[PDB]
Amino acid sequence: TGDLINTVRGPIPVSEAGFTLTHEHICGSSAGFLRAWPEFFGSRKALAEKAVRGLRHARAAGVQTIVDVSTFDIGRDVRLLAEVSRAADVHIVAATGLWFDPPLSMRMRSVEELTQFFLREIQHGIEDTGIRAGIIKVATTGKATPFQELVLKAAARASLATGVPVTTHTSASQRDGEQQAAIFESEGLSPSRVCIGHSDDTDDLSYLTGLAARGYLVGLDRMPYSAIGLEGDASALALFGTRSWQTRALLIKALIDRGYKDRILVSHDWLFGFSSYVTNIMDVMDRINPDGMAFVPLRVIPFLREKGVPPETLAGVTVANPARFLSPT
Ligand SMILES: CCOP(=O)(O)OCC
Ligand SMILES: [Co+2]
Numbered sequence: 001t002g003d004l005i006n007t008v009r010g011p012i013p014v015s016e017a018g019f020t021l022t023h024e025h026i027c028g029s030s031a032g033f034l035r036a037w038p039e040f041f042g043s044r045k046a047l048a049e050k051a052v053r054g055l056r057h058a059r060a061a062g063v064q065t066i067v068d069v070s071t072f073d074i075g076r077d078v079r080l081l082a083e084v085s086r087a088a089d090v091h092i093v094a095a096t097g098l099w100f101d102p103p104l105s106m107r108m109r110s111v112e113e114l115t116q117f118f119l120r121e122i123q124h125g126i127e128d129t130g131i132r133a134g135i136i137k138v139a140t141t142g143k144a145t146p147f148q149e150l151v152l153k154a155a156a157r158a159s160l161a162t163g164v165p166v167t168t169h170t171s172a173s174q175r176d177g178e179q180q181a182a183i184f185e186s187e188g189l190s191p192s193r194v195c196i197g198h199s200d201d202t203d204d205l206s207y208l209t210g211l212a213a214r215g216y217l218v219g220l221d222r223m224p225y226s227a228i229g230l231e232g233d234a235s236a237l238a239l240f241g242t243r244s245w246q247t248r249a250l251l252i253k254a255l256i257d258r259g260y261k262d263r264i265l266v267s268h269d270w271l272f273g274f275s276s277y278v279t280n281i282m283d284v285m286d287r288i289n290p291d292g293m294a295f296v297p298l299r300v301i302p303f304l305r306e307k308g309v310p311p312e313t314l315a316g317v318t319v320a321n322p323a324r325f326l327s328p329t
C-alpha cells in the first residue's frame with residue numbers, strides 16, 4: 001500500500017492495478033495520423049466505441065489494467081486513451097519512448113535530447129494534457145541501428161531518474177534481447193526494470209532462460225497471434241506466424257517449470273485499430289480472435305490451469321509480476 005503508478009486518469013495505488021495486461025494498444029498508428037485522417041478508421045467515434053466494447057469484454061473476463069505501449073511514433077493519442085479508459089472503467093498506463101518508426105525530428109536527436117523528451121512525458125506530461133507516462137517503450141528489429149542505440153541509452157537514463165520500467169519490441173528470432181540487455185547494462189540499469197518483449201515469437205528457451213537468469217522480465221505478449229488457416233494471405237502470415245496460441249502458451253509453463261515464474265509477463269499485443277499495416281488487417285484479426293483482450297483470461301489461463309499450473313502461480317504471473325514491474329523503483 002502507498003506505491004503509486006500513473007494512469008491516463010491519474011495516479012492509482014499499485015495494489016489496485018490487479019490483473020494487468022502489460023503490452024497492448026488501443027490503436028496502432030503513426031504520429032498525427034488519427035488527427036489528419038480519422039475516417040481511415042471509419043471515424044474517431046467509431047474507433048472509441050470499438051475500443052470501449054473490447055475493454056468492457058476484457059474487464060468482464062477479469063482484466064483490471066492494460067499498459068498501452070504505443071509511443072509517439074505509434075501515434076499514441078492520450079486523449080483517446082483517457083476517454084476509453086473512463087467509459088470502460090479499465091485503468092490504462094500510457095508509454096513514452098520510441099518504436100521503430102521515428103520521424104526525422106526524432107532520428108536527428110542526441111541521447112541527451114531523447115532523455116529530455118522521455119523525462120518530459122514521465123515527469124511533466126504528454127503534450128499539453130498533464131497525463132504522465134508510466135512506462136518507457138523501445139524497439140529493435142535485428143541488430144540496433146545507430147539511432148536505436150541512443151534510444152536504448154536514453155530509455156535507461158530516464159528509467160534511472162524516475163524508477164519507471166522499460167519494455168521492448170524485439171525481433172525474437174534474431175535474439176535482439178541479448179544486445180538490448182548489453183546496452184541497458186552499460187548504462188547501469190537493473191534487469192528487473194526491463195521487459196524483453198515479443199519473446200513468445202520464439203521457442204528458443206536457451207535465449208529466454210538466459211535473459212530470465214540475469215533478472216530480466218520476459219514478455220510473452222503475442223498470445224492470440226496465429227496465421228494457421230490463413231496461408232493464402234501473405235500479410236497475415238508474416239505478422240501472425242505459423243505457431244498456434246497453445247505453442248505460445250506452453251512457453252509460459254516452460255519458464256514456470258524452470259523456476260522463472262516471477263520473470264514472466266503475459267499479454268496479447270492486441271489493438272482496436274491498426275493503420276500502420278495493410279488495409280483491412282483489423283477484419284482479419286477480429287476473425288482470428290473475436291475475444292480481443294479477453295483471450296488471455298478466457299483461453300490461456302484455463303489452458304495453464306488444466307496443464308496443472310497452480311492458481312497461486314497464475315495470480316503471481318498476472319497480478320504480482322506487473323505490480324512489481326510497474327511500481328517505480
Ligand atoms: C502497433 C503495432 O505494434 P507491434 O507490437 O510492433 O506489432 C503489432 C502486431
Ligand atoms: Co512490437
Ligand SMILES: [Fe+2]
Pocket residue numbers: 023024025069269
Ligand atoms: Fe505492440
